[PDB]
Amino acid sequence: QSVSRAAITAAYRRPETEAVSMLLEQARLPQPVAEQAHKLAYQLADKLRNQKNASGRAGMVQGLLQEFSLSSQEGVALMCLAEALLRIPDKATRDALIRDKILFVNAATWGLLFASLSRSLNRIIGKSGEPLIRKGVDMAMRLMGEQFVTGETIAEALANARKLEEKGFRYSYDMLGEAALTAADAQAYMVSYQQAIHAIGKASNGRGIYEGPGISIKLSALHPRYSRAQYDRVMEELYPRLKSLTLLARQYDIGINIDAEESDRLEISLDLLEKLCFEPELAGWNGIGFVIQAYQKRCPLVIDYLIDLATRSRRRLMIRLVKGAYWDSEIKRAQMDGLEGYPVYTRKVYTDVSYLACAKKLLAVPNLIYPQFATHNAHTLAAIYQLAGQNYYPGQYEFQCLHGMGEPLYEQVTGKVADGKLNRPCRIYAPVGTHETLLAYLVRRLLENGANTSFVNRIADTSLPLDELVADPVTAVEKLAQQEGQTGLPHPKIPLPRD
Ligand SMILES: Cc1cc2nc3c(=O)[nH]c(=O)nc-3n(C[C@H](O)[C@H](O)[C@H](O)COP(=O)(O)OP(=O)(O)OC[C@H]3O[C@@H](n4cnc5c(N)ncnc54)[C@H](O)[C@@H]3O)c2cc1C
Q: Are strands 426-432 and 398-402 parallel, antiparallel or unpaired?
A: parallel
Angle at 236 between CA 234 and CA 237, to 5 degrees: 65
423 — alpha (psi -120 to 50), left (phi > 0) or beta?
Answer: left
C-alpha–C-alpha distance, residues 335 and 333, integer Å? 5
C-alpha dist (Å) from residue 221 to 138, 174, 178, 446? 22, 12, 4, 22
The dihedral formed by the CA atoms of 13, 16, 1 and 324, expressed in degrees to the nearest 10 = 80
275 in Cβ contact with 336 (< 8 Å): no
Distance from the CA of 297 to the center of ligand 1, in angstroms? 14
Other beta carbons within 10 angstroms of residue 419's beta carbon come to: 10
Nearest atom in ligand 1 to 352's CA:
30
- The pair phi, psi for residue 321, each rounded to 5°, is -90, 120
Other beta carbons within 10 angstroms of residue 91's beta carbon come to: 8
200 in Cβ contact with 194 (< 8 Å): no
154 in Cβ contact with 195 (< 8 Å): yes
Q: 316 CB less than 6 Å from ligand 1? A: no
Q: 323 CB less than 6 Å from ligand 1? A: yes
Angle at 273 between CA 267 and CA 276, to 5 degrees: 145
Who's near 237: CB < 8 A, 6+ residues apart?
223
C-alpha dist (Å) from residue 31 to 69, 352, 389, 465? 45, 18, 14, 22
C-alpha–C-alpha distance, residues 281 and 131, integer Å? 52
What is the number of structural domains in the chain? 1
C-alpha–C-alpha distance, residues 398 and 395, integer Å? 8
Q: Are strands 317-322 and 426-432 parallel, antiparallel or unpaired?
A: unpaired
Q: 375 CB less than 6 Å from ligand 1? A: yes
Distance from the CA of 352 to the center of ligand 1, in angstroms? 10
Q: 384 CB less than 6 Å from ligand 1? A: no
Tell me the Cα Rg of the chain: 26
Residue located nearest, by CA, to atom 24 of ligand 1? 375
C-alpha–C-alpha distance, residues 362 and 312, integer Å? 17
Domain interval for residue 33: 1-499
C-alpha–C-alpha distance, residues 253 and 201, integer Å? 7
Who's near 4: CB < 8 A, 6+ residues apart?
301, 304, 305, 308
Of 273, 318, 323, 428, the residue with max ligand 1 atoms within 8 A of its CB, to mutate for a pocket test, comes to: 323
C-alpha–C-alpha distance, residues 287 and 23, integer Å? 30
Other beta carbons within 10 angstroms of residue 58's beta carbon come to: 15
3-state secondary structure 421-443: CCCCCEEEEEEECCHHHCHHHHH
C-alpha–C-alpha distance, residues 107 and 77, integer Å? 7
Q: 374 CB less than 6 Å from ligand 1? A: yes
C-alpha–C-alpha distance, residues 175 and 249, integer Å? 15
Q: Considering only CA atoms, which of 448, 428, 474, 377 is closest in space to residue 33?
A: 474
488 in Cβ contact with 19 (< 8 Å): yes
- The pair phi, psi for residue 309, each rounded to 5°, is -65, -45
The dihedral formed by the CA atoms of 180, 186, 191 and 197, expressed in degrees to the nearest 10 = 60
Residue located nearest, by CA, to atom 44 of ligand 1? 348
The dihedral formed by the CA atoms of 355, 356, 362 and 365, expressed in degrees to the nearest 10 = -170
Distance from the CA of 291 to the center of ligand 1, in angstroms? 12
Nearest atom in ligand 1 to 447's CA:
49
C-alpha–C-alpha distance, residues 413 and 378, integer Å? 10
Who's near 22: CB < 8 A, 6+ residues apart?
none
Cross-strand bridge partners of residue 429:
172, 402
CA neighbours within 13 Å on the CB side: how many for 42?
12
Backbone CA torsion sign across 49, 50, 54, 56: positive
Q: 445 CB less than 6 Å from ligand 1? A: no
Distance from the CA of 444 to the center of ligand 1, in angstroms? 10
Burial class (CB in 10 A: 0-12, 13-18, 19+), 247: middle
397 in Cβ contact with 372 (< 8 Å): yes
C-alpha–C-alpha distance, residues 474 and 26, integer Å? 10
Q: 293 CB less than 6 Å from ligand 1? A: yes
Q: Buried (b) or exposed (e) across 189-223, using 16+ Cβ within 10 A?
A: bbebbeebbebbbebbeeeebbebbbbbbbbbbbb
Q: 381 CB less than 6 Å from ligand 1? A: no
297 in Cβ contact with 324 (< 8 Å): no
C-alpha–C-alpha distance, residues 224 and 238, integer Å? 9
C-alpha–C-alpha distance, residues 278 and 163, integer Å? 37
3-state secondary structure the chain: CCHHHHHHHHHCCCCHHHHHHHHHHHHCCCHHHHHHHHHHHHHHHHHHHCHHHHHHHHHHHHHHHHHCCCCHHHHHHHHHHHHHHHCCCCHHHHHHHHHHHCCCCCHHHHHCCCCCHHHHHHHHHHHHHHHHHHHHHHHHHHHHHHHHCCECCHHHHHHCCHHHHCCCCEEEEEECCCCCCCHHHHHHHHHHHHHHHHHHHHHHCCCHHHHCCEEEECHHHCCCCHHHCCHHHHHHHHHHHHHHHHHHHHHHCCCEEECCCCHHHHHHHHHHHHHHHCCHHHCCCCCEEEEEECCECCHHHHHHHHHHHHHHHCCCEEEEEECCCCHHHHHHHHHHHCCCCCCECCCHHHHHHHHHHHHHHHHCCCCCEEEEEECCCHHHHHHHHHHCCCCCCHHHCEEEEECCCCHHHHCCCCCCHHHCCCCCCEEEEEEECCHHHCHHHHHHHHHHHHCCCCHHHHCCCCCCCHHHHCCCHHHHHHHHHHHHCCCCCCCCCCCCCCC
C-alpha–C-alpha distance, residues 73 and 91, integer Å? 27
Cross-strand bridge partners of residue 172:
214, 429
Who's near 350: CB < 8 A, 6+ residues apart?
16, 19, 20, 477, 488
Residue located nearest, by CA, to atom 25 of ligand 1? 375
Distance from the CA of 323 to the center of ligand 1, in angstroms? 4
Q: 402 CB less than 6 Å from ligand 1? A: yes
CA 21 to chain CA mean position, Å: 25
* Overall residue count recorded for the chain in this entry: 499
Other beta carbons within 10 angstroms of residue 121's beta carbon come to: 10
CA 271 to chain CA mean position, Å: 26
Residue located nearest, by CA, to atom 47 of ligand 1? 324
CA neighbours within 13 Å on the CB side: how many for 497?
17
Who's near 40: CB < 8 A, 6+ residues apart?
382, 385, 386
Q: 327 CB less than 6 Å from ligand 1? A: yes
Cross-strand bridge partners of residue 154:
none
Nearest atom in ligand 1 to 355's CA:
25
Method by which this entry was solved: X-ray
254 in Cβ contact with 197 (< 8 Å): yes
Q: 324 CB less than 6 Å from ligand 1? A: yes
> What angle, 0 to 180 degrees and rounded to 10, lies between the N-to-C axes of helices 378-387 and 31-49?
140
Distance from the CA of 326 to the center of ligand 1, in angstroms? 8
Q: 290 CB less than 6 Å from ligand 1? A: no
Resolution (Å) of this entry: 1.7
Other beta carbons within 10 angstroms of residue 386's beta carbon come to: 21
3-state secondary structure 70-109: CCHHHHHHHHHHHHHHHCCCCHHHHHHHHHHHCCCCCHHH
Nearest atom in ligand 1 to 445's CA:
17
70 in Cβ contact with 114 (< 8 Å): no
Nearest atom in ligand 1 to 454's CA:
29
Who's near 74: CB < 8 A, 6+ residues apart?
none
C-alpha–C-alpha distance, residues 271 and 235, integer Å? 9
Distance from the CA of 426 to the center of ligand 1, in angstroms? 17
